[PDB]
Design an enzyme around this catalytic site. Sequence first.
Site, PDB file in Angstrom:
ATOM      1  N   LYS A  16      -5.499  -2.396 -19.636  1.00 20.31           N
ATOM      2  CA  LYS A  16      -5.321  -2.838 -19.427  1.00 20.31           C
ATOM      3  C   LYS A  16      -5.186  -4.377 -20.387  1.00 20.31           C
ATOM      4  O   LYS A  16      -4.043  -5.577 -19.808  1.00 20.31           O
ATOM      5  CB  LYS A  16      -6.991  -3.760 -18.666  1.00 20.31           C
ATOM      6  N   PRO A  37      -6.884   0.965  -9.383  1.00 19.70           N
ATOM      7  CA  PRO A  37      -7.972   1.224 -10.202  1.00 19.70           C
ATOM      8  C   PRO A  37      -7.615   2.025 -11.419  1.00 19.70           C
ATOM      9  O   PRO A  37      -6.379   2.048 -11.257  1.00 19.70           O
ATOM     10  CB  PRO A  37      -8.569   3.033  -9.235  1.00 19.70           C
ATOM     11  N   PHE A  38      -8.459   2.069 -12.490  1.00 20.94           N
ATOM     12  CA  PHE A  38      -8.206   2.808 -14.013  1.00 20.94           C
ATOM     13  C   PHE A  38      -6.794   3.705 -13.750  1.00 20.94           C
ATOM     14  O   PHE A  38      -6.162   3.173 -14.988  1.00 20.94           O
ATOM     15  CB  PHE A  38      -9.481   3.125 -14.480  1.00 20.94           C
ATOM     16  N   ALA A  54       1.232  -1.213  -0.102  1.00 23.82           N
ATOM     17  CA  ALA A  54      -0.188   0.191  -0.196  1.00 23.82           C
ATOM     18  C   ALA A  54       0.727   1.310   0.159  1.00 23.82           C
ATOM     19  O   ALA A  54       1.612   0.935   0.686  1.00 23.82           O
ATOM     20  CB  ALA A  54      -0.816  -0.174   1.039  1.00 23.82           C
ATOM     21  N   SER A  95      -9.813   4.636   4.417  1.00 21.60           N
ATOM     22  CA  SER A  95      -7.696   4.483   3.889  1.00 21.60           C
ATOM     23  C   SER A  95      -7.294   4.339   5.044  1.00 21.60           C
ATOM     24  O   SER A  95      -6.644   3.758   5.575  1.00 21.60           O
ATOM     25  CB  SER A  95      -7.736   5.278   3.230  1.00 21.60           C
TER      26      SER A  95
END
Length: 314
Positions: free
Chosen positions: A131, A83-84, A32, A43
């Site tokens: 991706k 995420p993207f 992380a 978070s």
Amino acid sequence: MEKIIIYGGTGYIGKFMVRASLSFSHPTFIYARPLTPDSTPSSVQLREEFRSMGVTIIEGEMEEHEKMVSVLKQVDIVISALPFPMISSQIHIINAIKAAGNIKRFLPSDFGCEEDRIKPLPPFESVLEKKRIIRRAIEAAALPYTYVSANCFGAYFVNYLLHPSPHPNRNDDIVIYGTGETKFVLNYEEDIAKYTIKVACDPRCCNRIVIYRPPKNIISQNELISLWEAKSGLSFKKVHMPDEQLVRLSQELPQPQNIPVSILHSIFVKGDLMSYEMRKDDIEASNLYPELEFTSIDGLLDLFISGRAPPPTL
Ligand SMILES: NC(=O)c1ccc[n+]([C@@H]2O[C@H](COP(=O)([O-])OP(=O)(O)OC[C@H]3O[C@@H](n4cnc5c(N)ncnc54)[C@H](OP(=O)(O)O)[C@@H]3O)[C@@H](O)[C@H]2O)c1
């Protein structure tokens, strides 16, 4: 049991994967980013919760090759739920994995449609291309992989499509994309997580595309709405956003505002989640584990009515 490390472990689907890994008795780790003054209290809370649950948290940046390699040498499986905006950064994971050399499986952050067999509107195709590039890099490094097409995140889409609330009103508008007869698949997040952990450790799924398509979760928007109305005991005002309007919006709206409508067009109009039949080497996960079962759509909706479903999320 295999040791599992998860990137994006504090994310929406990432947190379900972390809990599933622990529940299935896998020593669990997460890589992380370090916390900052602006870190959302959510978070911060999740990291504290994970530590108390026995999760080993490795804090660092994606560019820290030596740190990543050192950690990867201590585990067996890598699952990315990033995420993207972080998709391209997965290249660093791939490089650290290849350098470590002991990893048995890598699951990149796919968990959507089957990107290699569909071609949506430009705005969505653009993100899918990121991706695909990760997949090509995985293949070039010859890493053992599993590409998971999880189909629609259940609670995520029920919140988005039906926006359940304490006291529904006839006028709390329900939007139907396209005509509403297109079939898609809704899978509850907790199940997506559980099957993913099993899939990552299953030799049958190594270097394969795995699709989460339990027969009972295949449904159309019209069928979903009818079910929801029968359960909610009321008839909602239903409005349509026809194909032509979605296409027009994907072209006229600025980025990234043009992406959402492009994704909706792909799922509910083109039906890219059910416009194809299972391939030879393709694996449908619901057939794999007798000890597991995907929660039915009826079950997912009851979860919302009972007020025990995941809350809305961006
Ligand atoms: N099939 C579906 O219906 C569906 C729906 C939604 C998403 N997806 C897919 O599921 C995957 C994950 O999506 P998601 O919604 O779960 O992601 P998410 O919740 O947005 O993930 C954010 C996570 O990554 C970290 N992160 C965010 N920005 C970062 C940055 N700049 N640097 C480092 N770490 C960063 C966060 O850590 P902190 O705790 O530090 O913030 C957090 O763990 C994607 O591949 C997505 O396309 C599929």
